Amino acid sequence: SRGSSAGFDRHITIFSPEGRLYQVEYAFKAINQGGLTSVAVRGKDCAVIVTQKKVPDKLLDSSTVTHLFKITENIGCVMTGMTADSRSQVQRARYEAANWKYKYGYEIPVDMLCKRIADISQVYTQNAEMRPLGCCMILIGIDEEQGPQVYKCDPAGYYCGFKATAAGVKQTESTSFLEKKVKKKFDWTFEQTVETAITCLSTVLSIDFKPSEIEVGVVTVENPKFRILTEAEIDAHLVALAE
Amino acid sequence: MFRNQYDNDVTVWSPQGRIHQIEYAMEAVKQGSATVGLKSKTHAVLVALKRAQSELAAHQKKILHVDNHIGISIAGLTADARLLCNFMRQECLDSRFVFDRPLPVSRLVSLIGSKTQIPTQRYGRRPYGVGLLIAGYDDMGPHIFQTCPSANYFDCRAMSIGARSQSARTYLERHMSEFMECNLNELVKHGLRALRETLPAEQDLTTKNVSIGIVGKDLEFTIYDDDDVSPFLEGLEERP
Amino acid sequence: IGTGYDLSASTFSPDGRVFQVEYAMKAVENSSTAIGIRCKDGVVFGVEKLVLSKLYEEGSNKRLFNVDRHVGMAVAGLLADARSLADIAREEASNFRSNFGYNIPLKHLADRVAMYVHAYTLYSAVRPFGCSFMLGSYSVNDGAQLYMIDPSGVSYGYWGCAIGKARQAAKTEIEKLQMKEMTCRDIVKEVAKIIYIVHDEVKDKAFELELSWVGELTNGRHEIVPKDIREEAEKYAKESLK
Amino acid sequence: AWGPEAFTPDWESREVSTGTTIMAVQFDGGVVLGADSRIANRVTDKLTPIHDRIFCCRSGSAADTQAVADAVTYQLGFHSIELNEPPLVHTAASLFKEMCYRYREDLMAGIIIAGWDPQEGGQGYSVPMGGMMVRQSFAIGGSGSSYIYGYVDATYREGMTKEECLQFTANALALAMERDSGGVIRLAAIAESGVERQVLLG
Amino acid sequence: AAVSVYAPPVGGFSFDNCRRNAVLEADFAKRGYKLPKVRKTGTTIAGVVYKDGIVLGADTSKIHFISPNIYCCGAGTAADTDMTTQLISSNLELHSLSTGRLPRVVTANRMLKQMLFRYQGYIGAALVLGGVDVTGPHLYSIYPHGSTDKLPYVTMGSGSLAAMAVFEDKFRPDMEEEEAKNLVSEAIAAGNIDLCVISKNKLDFLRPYTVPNK
Amino acid sequence: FSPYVFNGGTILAIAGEDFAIVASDTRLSEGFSIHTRDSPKCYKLTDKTVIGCSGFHGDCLTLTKIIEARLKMYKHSNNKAMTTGAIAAMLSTILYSRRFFPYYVYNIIGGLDEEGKGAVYSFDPVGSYQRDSFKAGGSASAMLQPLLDNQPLSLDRAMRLVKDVFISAAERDVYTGDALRICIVTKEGIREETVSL
Amino acid sequence: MALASVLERPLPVNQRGFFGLGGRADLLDLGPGSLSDGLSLAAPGIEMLHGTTTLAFKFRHGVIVAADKKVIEINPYLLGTMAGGAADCSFWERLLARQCRIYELRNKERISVAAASKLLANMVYQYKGMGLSMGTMICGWDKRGPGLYYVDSEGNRISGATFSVGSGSVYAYGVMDRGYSYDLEVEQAYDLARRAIYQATVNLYHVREDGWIRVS
Amino acid sequence: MNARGLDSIPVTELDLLRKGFSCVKNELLPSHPLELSEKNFQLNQDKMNFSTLRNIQGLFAPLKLQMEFKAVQQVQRLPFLSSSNLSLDVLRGNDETIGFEDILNDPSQSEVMGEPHLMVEYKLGLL
Amino acid sequence: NPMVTGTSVLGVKFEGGVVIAADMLGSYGSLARFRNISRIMRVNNSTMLGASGDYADFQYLKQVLGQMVIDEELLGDGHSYSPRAIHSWLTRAMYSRRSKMNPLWNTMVIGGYADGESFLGYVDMLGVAYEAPSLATGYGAYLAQPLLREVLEKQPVLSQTEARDLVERCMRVLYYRDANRFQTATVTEKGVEIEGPL
């Protein structure tokens, strides 16, 4: 440690006169640096994750550019923000899930994983040597007694369970659209969940999508393993939506 | 004018992507005295110029002994030179004890660079302010290596470091094409003539301000001081 | 403008940026240009190596390392950091081979080294690395592969890459190649030609071309180009300059 | 003396063994892993699944072998998630060998590993006490390892059908168990399509 | 303040009286005296898995409590059994409070196994563990050296041979509750009697967990 | 598991007015079997000192390597080669460093002193040493010391005596070698020659 | 390697050549070391003094010690005797001499007999039961007059006017007990010591104001 | 497997009231087979986690864990008082389990304690 | 705790290099069912190694030595390990492991051909090392060393075919002592060639 900067704004362990930490808020602002948006919707018997896919160069290999990861055999993920921080947090989550399984003899639940990640992330807020990671994590999975589950955690260390959440630049508009849809009706099948998840992003960004511009991952009760849809299936869903 | 904030530590990058403390440490090499090192097809020679505090004090020694086939020359600080010399000696001793073979100069200099890179990245440290010239002999023949405070090393055929070494470098570059055929004589003479270019035009080289170190095919590292240097100085010309 | 928030690697700008990492990435553009092109059956590297003085040997301070029996590496930026990262990569490959008894896949090695690089941009007791590098490999069951890692810690797969002072012109020149349907023997000449075109002689006195490939010709091994092929490629590039 | 003659600690005879018998036999499409029963028990499963297509059988101290199996299952699952591919039997065998060799002076553990992978097909490895790692066409361990070795070696032939391999393994295990006991013999056939377990009684 | 202390102390077991006791016991045996001994329990215990629950039996209480759906029986050294059961019960209560739902049998089995293996079998406690959770009824058998074993019926104690013979003679998969109770009672008597019945119909797995009373 | 093995050998040392003689056999054995018939046990340390050790072979090798490393360290630190007495004191300290797990080696040091006369030192596996005029060690020391005691001399007569002592001792010992090596330390340097047995 | 240097605790995991639970880590450091001094931990023929007899007594004019070398000259003003293991006696008395010289250099005044005996006893007491065997009599003269102490490896440390250890201890002790006298001249003391050591079955020392001398 | 773990007699040539009642021979060997195993449980567990994590993922993970531990273990009370170890327990994963180190021989109620300055000097390495 | 002997390893020196023969048998104790395993290692272009004793330690040393060779050849500076360097490293490793009462139960034979001169060394678990024209360790160590010693004493200089025939006849005598398969390796100017099993 080389000391702590002086000011109500330049360090993590210094309270403002009004009683608020500003480095945490700046870490929150750091999420919008990527420029992408993510939407997660929970159905009657399924959970769906949809996100953008931007490939600017032509010499890039599009196979190696992705934002959907896999924690365990039955837990998915999607990250928004700084790429390196997202990957580091993914590795930490994998290690924590493996340790829980070894110690307790059965698979870790989604809420337990989210709580563990949030508890680890809170410690960086109360010490002068470490800094928060600029990313947010959304997990999906299926419980035994309960159905699908959607969870989200933020750099401040706060986590909650939702019915339909979003993150990124267009979070507010996505939240309003999802609120209207859920208030209207919630009983959805597998086809309806994917359709509404795609429609939210389409109508918020005002873009007619293409099969190679999005990536989708689903979890269903019949097949509880995380699965990433292919270009043909994405195109079929898009054609059905257009018709 | 705008540099005052970003030149107080080695853990801070300047807005132009430069570490100013490394460049400041590289300037301590030019605070010493000139040193010249060259090599031929068989031998490797080090020549150094010694200074004295006063007429009643012995001249400081510049050429040290590392092993039976490796020797170094110093230009810069002194404590760093002593620490590096201790490290070199320990590594050579351990290698000889374990494998019953001499330690190759390339491996030794790689170890030096790896050790020196560390204090330029972490807090609470400063870079080594010393530059070395290494002459050795192994299965690949003679070798001359140069070390920098920025943890950089080069494989040279003739090099000069210290204060006002540009003249020596110019002479070595001009006379580079004749080094690989000379025997020990005229090779020590080429080195001495190169070193003589760092002096004012009025004064010359005596036997109390020059040191010579030679290592060869079947001759171990030896240091010639004081009266042992006269045979090499007999044949020099009158500074043409 | 990030004045006041750019003295440590653990400080966030009011718009959510870390400026020390940005300065470290800016530092890479102070060195010469290195390119790498992936083709149908191999990967070939090329580095424009400046000459400091005539007193140095032929093989001094190279910029192409042998990480493993099947992996090459090309660097740009501060040299000492490049040596340190090469040592790290060698250690990782050796550890994997010792643990599991077969050659490490390229993607795993890239991930390991990228995470190690990223770990330095989190604490105030150290500073970010100041060098970028590329990795290349080939195997019968996987094919050619190429990756890049930058000081922030982000890695990606590429069909053709360029790092250094003049990456923009090099990328423009590369983007006019159908590298998917050619062979290493036909890519060495193109690499040499691009390097010669990009080089600027007004601000740089002289340079020496450095080349090496890995692929089916070398039977899955990273090797230096033979001297005659280097001479032929240089002659072709010089003729094409006219 | 002990210098020029190169004496050996002879791990396998540290204590007398009166346990069950375990065998793994390779056939064309995969591998067949079996174990017999020979106080209480008779309703116990002696086959421990390590992964979806990898199994193992244990010999020696119960607690030590169970702890080793738990740790190996941990490490293999973590590695498979990291590399994003189905695991190889060689990796599991190496993971067993590391701890079976480092703790040779503290634990009494003998492991045999059988499984299937898409790269090399059905494989069977032996890691006896001491840390040795050798791949074999057929592997025998336990108590009848000396009683039935000659018969198994003489009778064994090259890759046969799954049913013939199951019959051969059952015959060898029955001859091993009726040395002079129990009545329950458990078998498992591992192939690409999946494991196929069955129990023979009476 | 003591003048001979350099570092702060720690907790856990203490090994101060090891050598002193080692020589004292030898001297007392040589001169022929008596020293206090450790209390032991050796009464027979049993258990069986019927259609939709677990039945545990003991002879004279001796059936420990680990959770509303998990119970255990012990044989060996009384103090070790009590301590291990209490520690596992507290840890499982913390786990249930954190996770918000009833625990599982495999979790208790794993904790007990790892503890007993950690202490190298010097803590003598042979246990019979049984319970029911969302997956279904389960029954285990743990040993002092840290080796578990899953069976449909187990017996421990001095008179376990007759009980095992009775179970081998008259066991049938998926029997009724009364038949299981009668079988356990007869097996215990073949070697008063206490019976514990954990049934799926008396447990709700769709409600948030609340702390019970003790 | 015994970490000690006995190997045969026999060493001798005679100190003169301006010379020193160290001799030894050249056999390596393990009681019954014969390892090699060519293995001298005399090692040259500097231009004026020689050491001869016998016993367990691995300990002998380790001791010689440690001694050479320490000699190099002293030469680097003090800018001069160290004398015989300093070597003896350093070896005594090194030997006592392992009192509770000793080296199974018997050493004899011979060479010249500062004044230019012969010097002989004899040690024990723990480190006790003293200066003598002639000393015999090894397996056959017990049956060889009385002969020397009942029998300073010049170089030629001392060599004659050494030759007859070893030729008489070899025929009555089961560990003596087939060749004899003699190292002569004088003011002009060191020379050595091998005598067949 | 800068992140690993910050953590001021070198673990085997952070070093090179690590794989599995162990690896090529214990086979890396095989050098001969740089500088230290320390006895090795516990796991042939050891020279021991068996047929030796010693004698020592103090009187008005100093301390006279005789024996049958077997007497260690620690200092010009301090004397010692060995009995048992020669190597242990030599090593520990060399350490005692070094300690006495350090004390004299620091304090500009010679050490006393009591302090030296206490230092030797403290050094040899740490290894009780390990296997050390030594018995020493320490003679000297300081500001409080002549001194005489007996130190062994069992922690014993006693002071007296007459001591004797050896094979012929009983006879010589009886002789010099019969012939003892505090107010004794130097010549009669020499005669008594010679007669006692003769009847025990010849060296002879004499400590004075300004250092010991050799008589015969 | 976390509980299974895998020539230092210096001579002063590099106060007896402070230290006493100790001999090298008795401390040469342990008194019980479980003594060293219990004294070094946490160290062995950390070593095992570091080994597996380094073998599977790489060098970065154990280095980051050690850096976090060192950073969080520098804001404690002075050694003559008792600390709570909240964030260290959270990072280490022992925030929801109770062992035998917590209910036996409470360190917060120890029967011996030395001088403050002496402990602070000993921790710094001066003594 | 009980001890059993190890398999036999033979070695002779001829004009152009060295010849080494080793037994294919697993072990003489309860591990007799692990048949048909090789015990001959090729280190580099001018060094080969034969082992006799415990197999796990042999595999561990094989791993370490192969990794060291790969590490040295990656640099490509023109320096390689000579047979004497391997001999010294093995001796130091054995002694260091022995000093901690955790030895490596092995008895190695090293042969090589560098600079036009052959090499033949011997290392055991206690750190005893030497060089001899012929070596023999294992079950018939005392029944084969004098035979090879006298045969080489009669003719100090031997050819390749004569050395191979002598090794074959010694192995035949050893099998005739107690009643199958073996393999032979040779180091010369061409390199290390291994032929087997026979």
From Swiss-Prot, chain A:
The 26S proteasome consists of a 20S proteasome core and two 19S regulatory subunits. The 20S proteasome core is a barrel-shaped complex made of 28 subunits that are arranged in four stacked rings. The two outer rings are each formed by seven alpha subunits, and the two inner rings are formed by seven beta subunits. The proteolytic activity is exerted by three beta-subunits PSMB5, PSMB6 and PSMB7. Interacts with ALKBH4. One of its GO terms (molecular function) is purine ribonucleoside triphosphate binding. This is Proteasome subunit alpha type-6. Component of the 20S core proteasome complex involved in the proteolytic degradation of most intracellular proteins. This complex plays numerous essential roles within the cell by associating with different regulatory particles. Associated with two 19S regulatory particles, forms the 26S proteasome and thus participates in the ATP-dependent degradation of ubiquitinated proteins. The gene is PSMA6. Belongs to the peptidase T1A family. Keywords: Acetylation, Cytoplasm, Glycoprotein, Nucleus, Phosphoprotein, Proteasome. Pfam families: Proteasome, Proteasome_A_N. One of its GO terms (biological process) is regulation of inflammatory response. Glycans are attached at residue 4.
From Swiss-Prot, chain C:
The keyword Thylakoid does not apply. The modification Phosphoserine is found at residue 240. One of its GO terms (cellular component) is proteasome core complex. The modification N6-acetyllysine is found at residues 54, 203, 227. Gene3D superfamilies: Glutamine Phosphoribosylpyrophosphate, subunit 1, domain 1. It is found in: Cytoplasm; Nucleus. Its main location: cytoplasm. Keywords: Acetylation, Cytoplasm, Host-virus interaction, Nucleus, Phosphoprotein, Proteasome. Induction: Down-regulated by antioxidants BO-653 and probucol. Up-regulated by bacterial lipopolysaccharides (LPS) and TNF. It holds the Pfam family Proteasome. One of its GO terms (molecular function) is ubiquitin protein ligase binding. Belongs to the peptidase T1A family. Component of the 20S core proteasome complex involved in the proteolytic degradation of most intracellular proteins. This complex plays numerous essential roles within the cell by associating with different regulatory particles. Associated with two 19S regulatory particles, forms the 26S proteasome and thus participates in the ATP-dependent degradation of ubiquitinated proteins. This is Proteasome subunit alpha type-3. The gene is PSMA3.
From Swiss-Prot, chain E:
It catalyses: Cleavage of peptide bonds with very broad specificity. Gene3D superfamilies: Glutamine Phosphoribosylpyrophosphate, subunit 1, domain 1. InterPro entries: Ntn_hydrolases_N, Pept_T1A_subB, Proteasome_bsu_C, Proteasome_bsu_CS, Proteasome_sua/b, Proteasome_suB-type. Expressed at a low level in colonic mucosa. Up-regulated in colorectal cancer tissues. One of its GO terms (cellular component) is ficolin-1-rich granule lumen. Its main location: cytoplasm. Residues 1-42 form a propeptide. The 26S proteasome consists of a 20S proteasome core and two 19S regulatory subunits. The 20S proteasome core is a barrel-shaped complex made of 28 subunits that are arranged in four stacked rings. The two outer rings are each formed by seven alpha subunits, and the two inner rings are formed by seven beta subunits. The proteolytic activity is exerted by three beta-subunits PSMB5, PSMB6 and PSMB7. (Microbial infection) Interacts with HIV-1 Tat protein. This is Proteasome subunit beta type-7. It comes from Homo sapiens.
UniProtKB/Swiss-Prot annotation, chain H:
Keywords: Chaperone, Cytoplasm, Endoplasmic reticulum, Ichthyosis, Isopeptide bond, Membrane, Microsome, Nucleus, Palmoplantar keratoderma, Ubl conjugation. Its main location: cytoplasm. GO terms for biological process: proteasome assembly. This is Proteasome maturation protein. Molecular chaperone essential for the assembly of standard proteasomes and immunoproteasomes. Degraded after completion of proteasome maturation. Mediates the association of 20S preproteasome with the endoplasmic reticulum. InterPro entries: Ump1. It comes from Homo sapiens. There is a cross-link at residue 25 (Glycyl lysine isopeptide (Lys-Gly) (interchain with G-Cter in SUMO2)). It is found in: Cytoplasm, Cytosol; Nucleus; Microsome membrane.
